[PDB]
Amino acid sequence: PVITVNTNVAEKSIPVFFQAALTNMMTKALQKPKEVMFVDLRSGANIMMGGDRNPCVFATVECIGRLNPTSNLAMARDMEDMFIEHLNVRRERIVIRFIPVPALFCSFNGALHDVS
Amino acid sequence: PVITVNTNVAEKSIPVFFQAALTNMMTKALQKPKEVMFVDLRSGANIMMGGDRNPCVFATVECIGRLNPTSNLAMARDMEDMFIEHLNVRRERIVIRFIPVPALFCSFNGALHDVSIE
Amino acid sequence: PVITVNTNVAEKSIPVFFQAALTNMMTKALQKPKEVMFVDLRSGANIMMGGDRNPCVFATVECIGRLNPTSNLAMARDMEDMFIEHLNVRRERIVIRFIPVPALFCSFNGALHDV
Numbered sequence: 529p530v531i532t533v534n535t536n537v538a539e540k541s542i543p544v545f546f547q548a549a550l551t552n553m554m555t556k557a558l559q560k561p562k563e564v565m566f567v568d569l570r571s572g573a574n575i576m577m578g579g580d581r582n583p584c585v586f587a588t589v590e591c592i593g594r595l596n597p598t599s600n601l602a603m604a605r606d607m608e609d610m611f612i613e614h615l616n617v618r619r620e621r622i623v624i625r626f627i628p629v630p631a632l633f634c635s636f637n638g639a640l641h642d643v644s
Numbered sequence: 645p646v647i648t649v650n651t652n653v654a655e656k657s658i659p660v661f662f663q664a665a666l667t668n669m670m671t672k673a674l675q676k677p678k679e680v681m682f683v684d685l686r687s688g689a690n691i692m693m694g695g696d697r698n699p700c701v702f703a704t705v706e707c708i709g710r711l712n713p714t715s716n717l718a719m720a721r722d723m724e725d726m727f728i729e730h731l732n733v734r735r736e737r738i739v740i741r742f743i744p745v746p747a748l749f750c751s752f753n754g755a756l757h758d759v760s761i762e
Numbered sequence: 763p764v765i766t767v768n769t770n771v772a773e774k775s776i777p778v779f780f781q782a783a784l785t786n787m788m789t790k791a792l793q794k795p796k797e798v799m800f801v802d803l804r805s806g807a808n809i810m811m812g813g814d815r816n817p818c819v820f821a822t823v824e825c826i827g828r829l830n831p832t833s834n835l836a837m838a839r840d841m842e843d844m845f846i847e848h849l850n851v852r853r854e855r856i857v858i859r860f861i862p863v864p865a866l867f868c869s870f871n872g873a874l875h876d877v
Contacts, residue, residue, distance in 0.1 A: 530820050530857070534684055539808075551813045564857065566820050568768055568809040574655075574687070578679040579667045586646055586682050590859065597748035597756060604751030619754050623646070623680065625706065626749040632831035633860040635838030638853050640831060650802055690773070691802040695785045702764050702800050713866035713874060720869030735871050739764070739798060741824060742867040 530566040530590040537583050537615045539571040546614050557603045558594040584621040585611050595626045646682040646706040653731040655687040662730045673719045674710045700737040701727050708745045708762040716742045764800040764824040771849045773805040780848050791837050792828045818855040819845050829860045
């Protein structure tokens with residue numbers, strides 16, 4: 529999976545373990561091996577929300593399988609809680625998009641993904 | 645909604661009100677609350693087009709509802725006009741992708757979206 | 763089409779011809795006009811994989827048409843080979859997502875695309 533965090537929160541404000549913690553949380557949530565879990569953190573990004581530069585997050589979760597409205601809401605709340613705790617962003621400044629990826633439209637290590 | 649602008653035009657060349665202007669223009673175009681409009685500007689990006697480094701833009705518009713061929717063309721032309729004016733990019737150096745987002749695949753403020761509100 | 767390369771490999775480590783070479787290779791592979799081929803290289807990105815900061819790539823290929831399991835695998839292997847050779851990333855640290863784009867959901871030069 530790929531977890532992308534777009535935030536105007538400065539890198540210096542973010543705990544050094546943030547990506548590791550998000551990796552672990554999303555490995556558990558998505559039941560996906562850590563080996564193929566990416567966290568792409570865009571901190572100090574030039575991202576504004578509502579026309580203002582108060583702290584905000586737009587995050588994406590790209591995953592083969594695992595995404596559905598029930599799991600999405602549970603994971604969104606858990607991700608929001610991590611962003612609130614670690615990035616000091618208000619819940620009403622967080623938006624998360626869940627992006628289903630087809631197995632045969634994603635390569636890893638010289639092959640597509642083999643899912644029955 | 646999320647407007648993402650990937651451009652090789654340098655930040656110093658871009659009007660300071662570009663993201664505000666794009667926010668306002670796309671809030672009106674998409675008829676979405678301004679408060680949930682993001683504009684993510686990647687200026688001075690290492691993006692080449694056609695194998696050359698003349699000014700270019702690849703932009704994306706992520707939105708729950710609102711995107712359809714008619715609205716996409718109208719918004720593309722309006723975005724191109726703003727990119728031409730603000731970034732001094734030629735219309736033939738602009739590509740925009742419109743990305744429909746499912747209501748139940750997008751959270752805001754501790755909840756997913758309501759299809760009927762969106 | 764848009765080829766987006768997200769890598770923690772530093773810009774200074776990447777051959778000056780890399781984006782040009784990838785442009786040419788993917789113009790041929792996708793049979794799309796070179797004029798509308800973007801390569802958006804995000805080098806020195808803060809992207810970690812497997813909880814560690816060994817060299818990695820997450821790349822995307824956004825294309826109207828052309829993407830299917832057969833073409834995806836062939837292009838993936840060719841892109842992996844370029845990443846291995848030029849970015850010194852191991853094949854087991856490369857993931858590529860192929861993203862089909864609808865013709866009427868993408869503009870170029872004041873018009874949507876032919877469908």
